[PDB]
Amino acid sequence: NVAHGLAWSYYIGYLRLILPELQARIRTYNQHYNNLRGAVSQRLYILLPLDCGVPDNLSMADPNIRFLDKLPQYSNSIYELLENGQRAGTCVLEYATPLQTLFAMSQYSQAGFSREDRLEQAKLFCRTLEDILADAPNNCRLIAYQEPSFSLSQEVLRHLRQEEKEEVTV
Amino acid sequence: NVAHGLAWSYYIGYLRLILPELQARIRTYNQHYNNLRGAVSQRLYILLPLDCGVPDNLSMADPNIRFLDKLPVYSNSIYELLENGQRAGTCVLEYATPLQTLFAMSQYSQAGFSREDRLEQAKLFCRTLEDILADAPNNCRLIAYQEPFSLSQEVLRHLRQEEKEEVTV
């Protein structure tokens, strides 16, 4: 069951190293984006395409997701989200790199690892990660989505607004 | 059972990316080391301390393993192995980084992951990796060892066994 370990290693070996510093860096940044003319969500957003298809470049993949800026120090990028050519949201967005690992396996013959299997481990990966995140010492949402009526910018824009509702409320 | 996935990811995500190129790079190098004057084993050697203790610097750890050179995104280092202050062998030596992951877990409270567990997953990691390596498309040995024994000697052991197998078959 490879997903169990990929999840842990991604957390222990990556997430728990950037996320502490995260919301500071974003806060530090956000001053100027205010002055220059918007805000950047405080959570890191992670794309979990259950297809395990990670583009080498996210912006070219979805038209409505333009690159905007690199966040100052670990390499993180601020994307703007679009509606009608209008800036509609802005966050730090990333792909869960361990999917690349599940995808390479399903193209590795001696692995005997099928797409059947890969989708299964993908969901498992997503599940187990979420649990890890639950007990961890909130600046980090998981966005699992099965490519089909579906705009990726919209799924992201959805969470994005839900984040701002929770802030002004609680 | 975290070891199953760590193993695979280490292979798919690291090993199978450097090992193809490996033995060329070493061969390319080895000409000069001849002229300058020894040889460098053709396999990449991977340290699996079952304690999961990866020093930030290997040479400082064992006195008998001195750094010698970087081999020309992939960062690899040639070490010389010592006996009596004499150069006794020379290879590219590395620590299996996924152990660091097993060790961090056993110090992460909400993991509930014990040294009991860690040693278990370590061996498992070593086992499963070896199997992966078995069916893979030979420039790469695993050196699992439980600290109690002179590291350099365990490495020197394999090192010579490698040169035996070459001149024979």
Ligand SMILES: Nc1nc2c(ncn2[C@@H]2O[C@@H]3COP(=O)(O)O[C@H]4[C@@H](O)[C@H](n5cnc6c(=O)[nH]c(N)nc65)O[C@@H]4COP(=O)(O)O[C@H]3[C@H]2O)c(=O)[nH]1
């Ligand atoms: N966006 C992003 N994601 C990151 C970054 N660092 C790690 N990750 C993610 O973390 C996973 C596990 O990392 P690991 O614990 O360091 O565990 C690593 C490590 O043990 C080994 N490894 C990978 N690259 C190197 C390398 O260049 N040198 C050495 N010595 N080992 C490496 O491969 C293991 C797992 O392979 P991966 O497939 O790469 O899987 C990685 C990858 O999905 C990063 O800087 N940015």
